[PDB]
Coordinates of C-alpha atoms and ligand atoms in Angstrom, one line a residue:
Chain A
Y1 CA 15.8 33.2 6.8
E2 CA 13.1 31.8 4.4
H3 CA 13.6 28.3 3.0
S4 CA 11.7 25.5 1.2
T5 CA 12.0 21.9 0.4
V6 CA 10.1 18.8 -0.5
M7 CA 9.8 15.5 1.5
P8 CA 8.3 12.2 0.6
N9 CA 5.0 11.0 2.2
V10 CA 6.3 7.7 3.6
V11 CA 6.0 6.8 7.2
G12 CA 9.4 6.4 8.9
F13 CA 11.5 7.8 6.2
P14 CA 14.4 9.8 7.9
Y15 CA 14.1 12.9 5.7
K16 CA 17.1 15.3 6.2
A17 CA 16.9 18.8 5.0
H18 CA 20.1 20.9 4.7
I19 CA 20.1 24.7 5.1
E20 CA 23.2 26.7 4.0
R21 CA 23.1 30.4 5.0
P22 CA 26.2 32.2 3.6
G23 CA 27.1 34.0 6.7
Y24 CA 26.7 31.1 9.2
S25 CA 27.6 27.4 9.5
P26 CA 25.4 25.0 7.6
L27 CA 22.5 23.5 9.6
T28 CA 20.8 20.0 9.1
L29 CA 17.3 19.1 10.1
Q30 CA 15.9 15.7 10.6
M31 CA 12.1 15.3 10.0
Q32 CA 9.9 12.2 10.0
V33 CA 6.2 11.5 9.4
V34 CA 5.0 9.6 12.5
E35 CA 1.4 9.3 11.4
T36 CA -1.0 10.5 8.8
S37 CA -4.8 10.5 8.2
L38 CA -6.9 11.1 5.2
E39 CA -10.4 12.0 6.3
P40 CA -13.1 12.4 3.7
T41 CA -16.3 14.7 3.9
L42 CA -19.6 12.8 4.4
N43 CA -23.3 13.5 3.6
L44 CA -25.4 11.0 5.3
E45 CA -27.8 9.7 2.6
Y46 CA -29.9 7.2 4.6
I47 CA -29.9 4.3 7.0
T48 CA -31.0 0.6 6.8
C49 CA -31.8 -2.0 9.4
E50 CA -33.5 -5.3 9.4
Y51 CA -37.4 -5.1 9.3
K52 CA -40.0 -6.7 11.6
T53 CA -43.5 -7.4 10.4
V54 CA -46.4 -7.1 12.8
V55 CA -49.7 -8.9 12.3
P56 CA -52.6 -7.7 14.3
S57 CA -55.0 -10.2 15.7
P58 CA -57.6 -11.1 13.0
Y59 CA -61.1 -9.6 13.4
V60 CA -63.9 -12.0 12.3
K61 CA -67.3 -10.2 12.3
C62 CA -69.4 -13.2 11.9
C63 CA -73.2 -13.3 11.2
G64 CA -72.4 -9.9 9.7
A65 CA -70.1 -8.3 7.2
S66 CA -67.0 -6.0 7.4
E67 CA -65.5 -3.5 5.1
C68 CA -61.8 -2.8 4.6
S69 CA -60.4 0.7 5.5
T70 CA -57.0 2.2 4.4
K71 CA -54.4 3.7 6.7
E72 CA -50.9 5.4 6.5
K73 CA -48.5 2.6 7.4
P74 CA -45.4 1.6 5.4
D75 CA -46.5 -1.2 3.0
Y76 CA -50.0 -1.7 4.4
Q77 CA -52.1 -4.6 3.4
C78 CA -55.6 -5.4 4.4
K79 CA -58.3 -7.7 3.0
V80 CA -61.7 -9.3 3.7
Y81 CA -62.5 -13.1 3.2
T82 CA -66.0 -14.5 3.1
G83 CA -67.2 -17.9 4.1
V84 CA -65.1 -18.5 7.1
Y85 CA -66.3 -21.0 9.8
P86 CA -63.6 -20.9 12.6
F87 CA -63.1 -23.2 15.4
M88 CA -61.7 -22.7 18.9
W89 CA -60.5 -24.9 21.8
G90 CA -64.0 -25.8 23.0
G91 CA -66.2 -25.6 19.9
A92 CA -66.7 -23.6 16.8
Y93 CA -68.3 -20.3 17.4
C94 CA -70.0 -18.0 14.8
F95 CA -73.2 -20.0 14.9
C96 CA -74.5 -18.3 11.7
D97 CA -73.1 -21.0 9.5
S98 CA -71.9 -19.4 6.3
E99 CA -72.5 -15.6 6.4
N100 CA -69.1 -14.6 8.1
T101 CA -66.1 -12.4 7.3
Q102 CA -62.6 -12.2 8.3
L103 CA -60.5 -9.0 8.0
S104 CA -56.8 -9.4 7.9
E105 CA -54.3 -6.7 8.3
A106 CA -50.4 -6.5 8.0
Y107 CA -47.7 -3.8 7.9
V108 CA -44.0 -3.6 8.4
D109 CA -41.9 -1.7 10.9
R110 CA -38.2 -1.1 11.7
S111 CA -36.7 -3.6 14.0
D112 CA -36.3 -3.1 17.8
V113 CA -32.4 -2.8 17.5
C114 CA -32.3 -0.4 14.5
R115 CA -30.3 1.9 16.7
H116 CA -27.8 -0.7 17.7
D117 CA -27.4 -2.7 14.4
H118 CA -27.6 -0.7 11.2
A119 CA -25.8 0.2 8.0
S120 CA -25.4 3.8 6.8
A121 CA -25.0 5.0 3.2
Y122 CA -22.9 8.0 2.5
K123 CA -21.6 10.3 -0.4
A124 CA -18.0 11.2 0.0
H125 CA -15.8 13.8 -1.6
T126 CA -13.1 16.4 -0.9
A127 CA -10.7 14.6 1.4
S128 CA -8.7 16.5 4.0
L129 CA -5.4 15.4 5.2
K130 CA -3.9 15.6 8.7
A131 CA -0.5 14.6 9.9
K132 CA 1.8 14.2 12.8
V133 CA 5.5 14.8 12.3
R134 CA 8.7 14.7 14.4
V135 CA 11.3 17.5 14.1
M136 CA 14.9 17.5 15.4
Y137 CA 17.8 19.9 15.1
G138 CA 20.5 21.5 17.2
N139 CA 19.3 20.3 20.7
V140 CA 15.5 20.3 20.2
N141 CA 13.3 17.2 19.9
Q142 CA 9.6 17.1 19.6
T143 CA 6.6 15.8 17.6
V144 CA 3.7 18.1 16.5
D145 CA 0.3 17.8 14.8
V146 CA -0.3 19.6 11.6
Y147 CA -3.0 20.1 9.0
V148 CA -1.5 19.5 5.5
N149 CA -2.8 22.3 3.5
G150 CA -1.2 25.6 3.1
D151 CA -3.4 27.1 6.0
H152 CA -1.7 25.9 9.2
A153 CA 1.7 27.0 10.6
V154 CA 3.1 25.6 13.8
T155 CA 6.1 27.0 15.7
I156 CA 8.8 24.5 17.0
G157 CA 11.2 26.3 19.4
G158 CA 11.4 29.6 17.5
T159 CA 11.1 28.2 13.9
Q160 CA 8.0 28.4 11.8
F161 CA 6.9 25.5 9.5
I162 CA 4.1 25.3 6.9
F163 CA 3.1 22.1 5.1
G164 CA 1.8 22.7 1.6
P165 CA -1.0 20.7 -0.2
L166 CA -0.4 17.2 -1.1
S167 CA 1.2 16.7 -4.6
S168 CA -1.3 14.1 -5.6
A169 CA -5.1 14.1 -5.3
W170 CA -5.7 10.3 -4.9
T171 CA -8.3 9.1 -2.6
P172 CA -9.3 5.4 -2.0
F173 CA -13.0 6.1 -1.0
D174 CA -15.0 6.0 -4.1
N175 CA -18.1 8.4 -4.6
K176 CA -20.5 6.3 -2.6
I177 CA -19.8 4.6 0.6
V178 CA -21.6 2.0 2.8
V179 CA -20.4 1.9 6.5
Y180 CA -21.2 -0.9 8.9
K181 CA -19.4 -1.4 12.3
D182 CA -15.9 -0.9 11.2
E183 CA -15.9 -1.8 7.5
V184 CA -16.1 0.5 4.5
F185 CA -17.4 -0.7 1.1
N186 CA -17.2 0.9 -2.3
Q187 CA -20.8 0.1 -3.2
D188 CA -23.4 1.8 -5.2
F189 CA -26.7 1.9 -3.2
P190 CA -30.0 2.6 -4.9
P191 CA -31.3 6.1 -4.3
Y192 CA -33.8 7.0 -1.7
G193 CA -37.4 5.9 -2.3
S194 CA -36.5 3.4 -5.0
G195 CA -35.4 0.2 -3.2
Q196 CA -36.1 -3.3 -4.3
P197 CA -37.4 -6.3 -2.4
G198 CA -34.8 -8.9 -1.2
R199 CA -31.8 -6.8 -1.6
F200 CA -29.9 -3.9 0.1
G201 CA -32.3 -1.0 1.0
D202 CA -35.7 -2.9 1.0
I203 CA -36.6 -0.6 4.0
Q204 CA -35.0 2.9 4.3
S205 CA -35.1 5.7 6.8
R206 CA -33.7 9.3 6.6
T207 CA -32.0 8.9 10.0
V208 CA -32.0 6.5 12.8
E209 CA -34.2 8.8 15.0
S210 CA -36.7 9.8 12.3
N211 CA -40.3 8.9 12.0
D212 CA -41.0 8.2 8.4
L213 CA -40.0 4.8 6.8
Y214 CA -40.1 3.6 3.2
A215 CA -40.4 -0.3 2.9
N216 CA -41.1 -2.4 -0.1
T217 CA -41.1 -6.2 0.6
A218 CA -44.0 -7.4 -1.6
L219 CA -46.1 -8.5 1.4
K220 CA -49.1 -10.5 0.3
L221 CA -52.0 -12.1 2.3
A222 CA -53.7 -15.4 1.4
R223 CA -57.1 -16.7 2.2
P224 CA -57.1 -18.7 5.4
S225 CA -57.6 -22.5 5.4
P226 CA -61.0 -23.7 6.3
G227 CA -61.6 -24.0 10.0
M228 CA -58.7 -22.0 11.1
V229 CA -57.8 -18.5 12.5
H230 CA -54.3 -17.8 11.3
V231 CA -54.0 -14.9 8.8
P232 CA -51.4 -16.2 6.4
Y233 CA -48.9 -14.2 4.6
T234 CA -45.9 -14.5 2.3
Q235 CA -42.9 -12.0 2.1
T236 CA -39.4 -12.0 0.7
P237 CA -36.8 -12.2 3.4
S238 CA -35.1 -9.2 4.9
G239 CA -32.8 -7.6 2.4
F240 CA -30.3 -6.4 5.1
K241 CA -29.7 -9.9 6.2
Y242 CA -28.8 -11.2 2.7
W243 CA -26.6 -8.2 2.1
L244 CA -24.9 -9.3 5.3
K245 CA -24.5 -12.8 3.9
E246 CA -23.3 -11.8 0.4
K247 CA -21.8 -8.3 0.7
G248 CA -18.5 -9.6 -0.7
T249 CA -15.1 -8.2 0.0
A250 CA -14.4 -5.0 1.9
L251 CA -12.1 -2.0 1.7
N252 CA -9.8 -2.8 4.7
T253 CA -8.5 -5.8 2.7
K254 CA -8.5 -4.2 -0.7
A255 CA -7.2 -0.6 -0.4
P256 CA -4.2 0.2 -2.4
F257 CA -0.8 1.5 -1.1
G258 CA -1.2 -0.4 2.0
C259 CA -3.2 2.1 4.0
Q260 CA -5.5 1.1 6.9
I261 CA -9.2 1.9 6.8
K262 CA -10.8 2.7 10.1
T263 CA -14.2 4.0 11.2
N264 CA -15.8 6.5 13.6
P265 CA -15.0 8.7 11.8
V266 CA -14.1 7.1 8.6
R267 CA -10.4 7.6 7.6
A268 CA -7.6 6.1 5.8
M269 CA -4.4 6.1 7.8
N270 CA -0.7 5.9 7.0
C271 CA -1.4 6.0 3.3
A272 CA 1.9 6.3 1.3
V273 CA 1.6 8.5 -1.8
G274 CA 3.1 11.6 -3.1
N275 CA 5.2 14.4 -1.8
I276 CA 4.7 17.1 0.9
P277 CA 6.3 20.6 0.2
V278 CA 7.7 22.3 3.3
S279 CA 8.0 26.0 3.7
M280 CA 10.2 27.2 6.7
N281 CA 11.2 30.4 8.5
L282 CA 14.0 30.5 10.8
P283 CA 15.3 32.9 13.5
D284 CA 18.9 34.0 13.9
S285 CA 19.4 32.2 17.2
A286 CA 19.2 28.8 15.5
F287 CA 22.4 29.2 13.4
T288 CA 26.0 29.6 14.7
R289 CA 28.6 32.2 13.8
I290 CA 31.5 31.1 11.6
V291 CA 33.9 32.1 14.2
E292 CA 33.1 29.4 16.7
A293 CA 32.5 26.5 14.3
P294 CA 35.6 24.4 13.3
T295 CA 37.5 24.9 10.1
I296 CA 37.7 21.9 7.8
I297 CA 40.2 21.8 5.0
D298 CA 41.6 19.2 2.7
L299 CA 38.7 16.8 2.7
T300 CA 39.0 13.4 1.1
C301 CA 36.5 10.5 0.9
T302 CA 37.0 6.8 0.8
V303 CA 34.5 3.9 0.9
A304 CA 35.3 0.8 2.9
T305 CA 32.4 -1.5 1.6
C306 CA 29.1 -1.1 0.0
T307 CA 26.0 -3.3 0.1
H308 CA 22.7 -2.1 -1.5
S309 CA 20.4 -3.5 1.1
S310 CA 17.4 -2.0 2.9
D311 CA 19.3 -1.2 6.1
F312 CA 22.3 1.2 6.1
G313 CA 24.8 -0.9 4.3
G314 CA 27.8 1.2 3.3
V315 CA 30.7 2.7 5.5
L316 CA 32.3 5.9 4.4
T317 CA 35.5 7.4 5.8
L318 CA 36.5 11.1 5.6
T319 CA 39.9 12.5 6.1
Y320 CA 40.5 16.2 6.8
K321 CA 42.7 18.6 8.7
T322 CA 41.2 20.9 11.4
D323 CA 42.4 23.4 13.9
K324 CA 40.1 22.7 16.9
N325 CA 37.8 20.0 17.9
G326 CA 34.0 20.5 17.6
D327 CA 30.8 19.5 15.8
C328 CA 29.8 19.6 12.2
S329 CA 26.6 18.8 10.1
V330 CA 27.2 16.1 7.5
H331 CA 25.0 16.0 4.4
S332 CA 24.8 14.2 1.0
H333 CA 23.7 16.5 -1.9
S334 CA 22.0 13.7 -3.7
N335 CA 19.3 11.3 -3.1
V336 CA 21.3 8.4 -4.6
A337 CA 22.7 7.9 -1.1
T338 CA 21.1 8.7 2.3
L339 CA 23.3 9.1 5.3
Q340 CA 22.2 7.8 8.8
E341 CA 23.1 10.8 11.0
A342 CA 23.0 14.6 10.7
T343 CA 25.9 15.6 13.1
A344 CA 29.4 14.4 13.6
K345 CA 32.2 15.1 16.0
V346 CA 35.4 16.4 14.4
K347 CA 38.6 15.9 16.4
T348 CA 42.3 16.7 15.7
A349 CA 42.9 13.0 14.7
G350 CA 41.6 13.9 11.2
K351 CA 39.5 10.9 10.3
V352 CA 35.6 10.3 10.8
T353 CA 33.3 7.6 9.6
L354 CA 29.7 7.6 8.6
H355 CA 27.0 5.1 7.5
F356 CA 25.0 5.4 4.4
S357 CA 22.5 3.4 2.4
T358 CA 22.1 3.2 -1.4
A359 CA 20.1 1.3 -4.1
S360 CA 22.3 1.4 -7.2
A361 CA 25.4 -0.8 -8.1
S362 CA 27.6 2.4 -8.5
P363 CA 26.7 5.5 -6.6
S364 CA 28.6 8.9 -6.9
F365 CA 27.5 11.6 -4.6
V366 CA 29.1 14.8 -3.0
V367 CA 29.2 14.8 0.8
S368 CA 29.7 18.0 2.9
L369 CA 31.1 18.3 6.5
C370 CA 30.5 21.6 8.0
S371 CA 31.3 23.9 5.0
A372 CA 33.8 21.6 3.2
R373 CA 33.1 19.3 0.2
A374 CA 34.1 16.0 -1.3
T375 CA 33.1 13.6 -3.9
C376 CA 32.5 9.9 -3.0
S377 CA 32.4 7.1 -5.6
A378 CA 32.2 3.3 -4.9
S379 CA 31.3 -0.1 -6.1
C380 CA 28.4 -2.1 -4.5
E381 CA 27.6 -5.7 -4.2
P382 CA 24.1 -7.4 -3.9
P383 CA 22.7 -8.6 -0.6
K384 CA 22.4 -12.3 -0.2
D385 CA 19.3 -12.5 1.9
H386 CA 15.9 -12.7 0.2
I387 CA 13.3 -11.3 2.6
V388 CA 13.4 -8.7 5.4
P389 CA 10.7 -7.3 7.7
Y390 CA 11.7 -3.5 7.6
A391 CA 10.8 -1.2 4.8
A392 CA 13.4 0.4 2.5
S393 CA 15.5 3.4 3.8
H394 CA 16.9 4.4 0.4
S395 CA 15.0 6.6 -2.1
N396 CA 15.2 3.7 -4.6
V397 CA 17.2 4.8 -7.7
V398 CA 19.1 2.3 -9.9
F399 CA 20.6 4.1 -12.8
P400 CA 24.3 3.9 -12.3
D401 CA 27.0 6.5 -12.6
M402 CA 28.5 7.4 -16.0
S403 CA 31.8 6.3 -14.6
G404 CA 30.5 2.9 -13.5
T405 CA 31.9 -0.2 -14.9
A406 CA 28.9 -1.0 -17.0
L407 CA 28.8 2.5 -18.6
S408 CA 32.6 2.3 -18.9
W409 CA 32.4 -0.8 -21.2
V410 CA 29.4 0.9 -23.2
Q411 CA 31.5 4.0 -23.6
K412 CA 34.6 2.0 -24.8
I413 CA 32.6 0.0 -27.3
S414 CA 30.8 3.1 -28.6
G415 CA 34.0 5.1 -28.9
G416 CA 35.7 2.4 -30.9
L417 CA 32.8 2.1 -33.3
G418 CA 32.4 5.9 -33.7
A419 CA 36.1 6.3 -34.4
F420 CA 35.9 3.6 -37.0
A421 CA 32.9 5.3 -38.7
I422 CA 34.7 8.7 -38.6
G423 CA 37.7 7.0 -40.3
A424 CA 35.4 5.6 -42.9
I425 CA 33.9 9.0 -43.7
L426 CA 37.3 10.7 -43.8
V427 CA 38.5 8.1 -46.4
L428 CA 35.5 8.4 -48.6
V429 CA 35.5 12.3 -48.6
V430 CA 39.3 12.3 -49.3
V431 CA 38.7 10.0 -52.3
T432 CA 35.8 12.2 -53.5
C433 CA 37.8 15.4 -53.1
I434 CA 40.8 13.9 -54.9
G435 CA 38.5 13.0 -57.7
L436 CA 37.3 16.6 -57.8
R437 CA 40.6 18.3 -57.7
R438 CA 41.6 16.6 -61.0
Chain B
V367 CA 18.6 -5.6 -28.4
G368 CA 18.5 -1.9 -29.0
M369 CA 22.3 -1.5 -28.4
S370 CA 23.2 -4.6 -30.6
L371 CA 21.0 -3.2 -33.6
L372 CA 22.7 0.1 -33.3
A373 CA 26.1 -1.4 -33.3
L374 CA 25.5 -3.7 -36.2
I375 CA 23.9 -0.8 -38.2
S376 CA 26.8 1.4 -37.6
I377 CA 29.4 -1.2 -38.6
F378 CA 27.7 -2.2 -41.7
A379 CA 27.3 1.4 -42.8
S380 CA 30.9 2.1 -42.3
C381 CA 32.1 -1.0 -44.2
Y382 CA 29.8 0.0 -47.0
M383 CA 31.5 3.4 -47.0
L384 CA 34.9 1.8 -47.5
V385 CA 33.5 -0.5 -50.3
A386 CA 32.0 2.5 -52.1
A387 CA 35.3 4.5 -51.7
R388 CA 37.3 1.7 -53.1
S389 CA 35.1 1.3 -56.1
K390 CA 35.2 4.9 -56.8
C391 CA 39.1 5.1 -56.5
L392 CA 39.6 2.0 -58.6
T393 CA 37.1 2.2 -61.4
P394 CA 39.0 4.7 -63.6
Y395 CA 42.0 2.4 -63.7
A396 CA 39.8 -0.4 -65.0
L397 CA 39.2 1.6 -68.3
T398 CA 42.8 2.0 -69.4
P399 CA 45.4 -0.7 -69.9
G400 CA 47.8 1.1 -67.6
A401 CA 50.1 0.6 -64.6
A402 CA 48.6 -0.2 -61.2
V403 CA 51.3 2.1 -59.5
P404 CA 53.0 -0.5 -57.1
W405 CA 52.9 2.3 -54.4
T406 CA 49.1 2.4 -54.5
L407 CA 48.9 -1.3 -55.5
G408 CA 50.4 -2.3 -52.1
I409 CA 48.4 0.2 -50.2
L410 CA 44.9 -0.7 -51.6
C411 CA 43.9 -4.4 -52.3
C412 CA 42.8 -4.4 -55.9
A413 CA 41.8 -7.3 -58.1
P414 CA 45.2 -7.6 -60.1
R415 CA 47.8 -8.2 -57.3
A416 CA 50.7 -8.1 -59.7
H417 CA 49.0 -8.6 -63.1
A418 CA 49.8 -5.1 -64.5
Chain C
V263 CA -11.5 -15.5 21.3
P264 CA -8.5 -17.7 20.8
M265 CA -5.4 -16.9 18.7
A266 CA -4.2 -19.4 16.1
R267 CA -0.7 -20.5 15.9
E268 CA 1.9 -18.7 14.0
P269 CA 2.6 -20.2 10.6
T270 CA 6.0 -21.4 9.4
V271 CA 7.6 -19.2 6.7
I272 CA 10.1 -20.2 4.0
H273 CA 11.9 -17.4 2.2
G274 CA 12.2 -17.5 -1.6
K275 CA 13.0 -15.3 -4.7
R276 CA 10.1 -12.7 -4.3
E277 CA 8.0 -15.5 -3.1
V278 CA 7.0 -16.8 0.4
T279 CA 6.0 -20.3 1.1
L280 CA 3.8 -20.7 4.0
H281 CA 2.6 -23.7 6.1
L282 CA -0.7 -23.4 7.8
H283 CA -1.9 -25.6 10.7
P284 CA -5.4 -24.6 12.0
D285 CA -7.5 -26.3 14.5
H286 CA -10.8 -24.9 13.5
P287 CA -11.8 -22.9 10.4
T288 CA -9.9 -19.6 10.3
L289 CA -9.7 -16.8 8.0
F290 CA -6.5 -16.2 6.0
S291 CA -6.1 -13.1 3.8
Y292 CA -3.2 -11.1 2.2
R293 CA -2.6 -8.2 -0.1
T294 CA 0.3 -6.7 -1.9
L295 CA 0.6 -3.1 -0.8
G296 CA 1.8 -1.6 -4.1
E297 CA 0.0 0.7 -6.5
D298 CA -2.3 -2.1 -7.7
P299 CA -3.0 -4.7 -5.1
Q300 CA -3.5 -8.5 -5.2
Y301 CA -6.8 -9.0 -3.4
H302 CA -7.5 -12.5 -1.9
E303 CA -9.2 -14.1 1.1
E304 CA -10.1 -17.7 2.0
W305 CA -11.5 -20.0 4.7
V306 CA -8.8 -22.5 5.4
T307 CA -9.9 -25.7 7.1
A308 CA -7.3 -28.4 7.1
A309 CA -3.5 -28.2 7.1
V310 CA -2.2 -26.7 3.9
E311 CA 0.7 -24.8 2.1
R312 CA 0.4 -21.5 0.4
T313 CA 2.7 -19.4 -1.9
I314 CA 2.3 -15.7 -1.8
Chain D
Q196 CA 11.6 -29.5 10.5
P197 CA 8.6 -28.7 12.8
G198 CA 5.2 -29.6 11.4
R199 CA 6.2 -32.4 9.0
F200 CA 7.7 -35.9 9.1
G201 CA 10.6 -36.3 11.6
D202 CA 10.2 -33.3 13.8
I203 CA 11.2 -35.6 16.7
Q204 CA 13.7 -38.3 16.2
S205 CA 15.6 -41.0 18.2
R206 CA 18.4 -43.2 17.1
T207 CA 16.6 -46.3 18.7
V208 CA 13.7 -46.9 20.9
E209 CA 15.8 -47.4 24.1
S210 CA 18.1 -44.5 23.3
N211 CA 18.3 -41.9 26.1
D212 CA 19.1 -39.1 23.5
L213 CA 16.2 -37.4 21.6
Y214 CA 16.2 -34.6 19.1
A215 CA 13.1 -32.5 19.0
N216 CA 12.3 -29.3 16.9
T217 CA 8.7 -28.2 17.3
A218 CA 9.0 -24.4 17.8
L219 CA 7.7 -24.3 21.3
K220 CA 7.2 -20.7 22.4
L221 CA 6.0 -19.5 25.7
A222 CA 3.8 -16.4 26.3
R223 CA 3.0 -13.9 29.0
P224 CA 0.3 -15.0 31.3
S225 CA -2.9 -13.0 31.3
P226 CA -3.8 -10.8 34.4
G227 CA -5.1 -12.4 37.4
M228 CA -4.5 -16.2 36.4
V229 CA -1.9 -18.9 36.9
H230 CA -1.8 -20.9 33.6
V231 CA 1.6 -20.7 31.8
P232 CA 0.4 -20.4 28.2
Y233 CA 2.3 -21.8 25.4
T234 CA 2.0 -22.2 21.5
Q235 CA 3.4 -25.0 19.4
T236 CA 3.0 -26.5 16.0
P237 CA 1.1 -29.7 16.0
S238 CA 2.9 -33.1 15.8
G239 CA 4.3 -33.9 12.3
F240 CA 3.7 -37.7 12.8
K241 CA -0.1 -37.5 12.9
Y242 CA -0.2 -35.2 9.8
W243 CA 2.2 -37.6 8.0
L244 CA -0.4 -40.3 9.0
Ligands
LIG1 C1 13.2 12.3 20.7 O1 12.0 11.9 21.4 C2 11.7 10.5 21.0 C3 10.4 10.2 21.8 O2 10.4 11.0 23.1 C4 12.8 9.5 21.3 O3 12.5 8.2 20.9 C5 12.7 7.4 22.2 O4 14.0 7.0 22.3 C6 14.3 6.1 23.4 C7 15.7 5.8 23.5 O5 16.2 5.4 22.2 C8 13.3 5.0 23.4 O6 13.4 4.3 24.7 C9 13.8 2.9 24.4 O7 13.1 2.2 23.4 C10 13.4 0.9 23.2 C11 12.6 0.4 22.1 O8 12.9 -0.9 21.8 C12 13.2 0.0 24.5 O9 13.5 -1.3 24.2 C13 14.1 0.5 25.6 O10 13.9 -0.1 26.7 C14 13.8 2.1 25.8 O11 12.5 2.2 26.4 C15 11.9 5.3 23.3 O12 11.0 4.2 23.0 C16 11.8 6.1 21.9 N1 10.4 6.6 21.8 C17 9.7 6.3 20.6 C18 8.3 6.8 20.6 O13 10.2 5.7 19.7 C19 14.1 10.0 20.6 O14 15.3 9.3 20.9 C20 14.4 11.5 21.0 N2 15.5 11.9 20.2 C21 16.8 11.8 20.6 C22 17.9 12.3 19.9 O15 17.1 11.2 21.7

């Protein structure tokens, strides 16, 4: 027997689905969403790590001259300075007094720990959602792992389920991502090959294991002081370190809807938004024949108390008349109220009690026990406490019933004024028609 | 506020309807020195209570 | 690493007043998990009170 | 109240009775040690000072 329904994407919400097949006793299903996971698709763009600049020992060809030659190193710098008269620990060599030359070189390379301490830049799109849900009915428990798109069906004890695509298409990960350790940032990194000194991406590599490197740190060399051998340079500090110092914020503490970011792989877990459609298919062994189910006639509903709190705060009593004692499947045919349980024991005494939760001052809903029916209407009072640590178990509707006290007063006042207006119109039209008849 | 404005608009309109009806029903009698017809004089509150 | 003491909470009308007693500079952050959050994070040093 | 003035009070200096409210909460000891951990809000008198 094919069936379909819709359930909210809120962790811990005790969704109950009610299936009524005309030839068999009604059945009630309990479903919950134990865990979710919104995993995006990643295209690694490049990697960054702190740089390390290497300075080869200066070559002083003295009483002679040298020539500078180019090489292929990232950000290579080399120069020749004339007129050097160096000194050493014993005494100044290069005895040819003033015709000397020093050749300085410098070039940059990735740090030693670039494979242990680095930041990645990604482009993210097309999220895929995964879920883990609990199903109960009849006498079968069990939680199962499901892909949420209309392309995975999992069988639970003879029943087949399919979870349709998410109603909304909201994803917290922006178009461009920067990942470090276990933190995700909505940053806009500069493209490959166009970094700037002193900021993020001053050196860039395609991957951690690659050979090439593109570095741009404005490395400059200065003529050495007289009587020294020290090859001075100047260079703006590592961009990665200052990005570390002033990255600013994160996503783990800024994502909406209260969903936790993690890493390895990047994902957003338990992230409350939207609705999940469910398409079912059931075998004939799941139901029960009418003949063995109890018969319930003359169903009446009363409400003991109501209290629109987060926990189940209303007690409801049902009176009936039955022939034999057994089991029935309670349900509420509206979302204004949510019952706690999905089964009840019916006995010859004739009275049963249930717990429900609401969020409106005056609810009015129809409750069914096995195949019977009844209407329940009640008045509710506010809760006195201010803060609680467990989430809402009602579906959060506040518009009252049309028979509620507030709408009763509105209706009475509107009726009085409308009747007065109709009387006015009748008087004026009567006078006009009397004027015409003459 | 919306409900209050609707109520006031309705009540003022209906009162205006009664006023216009009384003017229409009483202005012909204000052009002839005739009887006020005690039967309608008591029913509808006109300017002359008992003065003709 | 050590764990700082639990703060003292006071319940209010949609507001929570919170007493903080640190021994060394700790990090304190919070967010409202609605549709549009209230981002915030701070480095508390000496004993203070916050309202959230 | 714990954490402010008057968390510990005595009727007089020599009084045997004492009223204390400091939210002293014990914890489960870590594996392989004998140290009876606890946690407790600092003294309110010093913060009043
Ligand atoms: C369907 O299966 C799930 C998991 O197998 C059942 O949930 C489990 O219910 C038992 C009994 O209620 C829990 O054991 C108790 O947990 C409390 C938690 O405070 C603990 O204090 C007790 O000492 C005892 O261990 C168990 O934790 C719970 N499991 C989970 C993951 O929540 C569920 O009850 C089954 N359905 C039915 C109708 O029994």
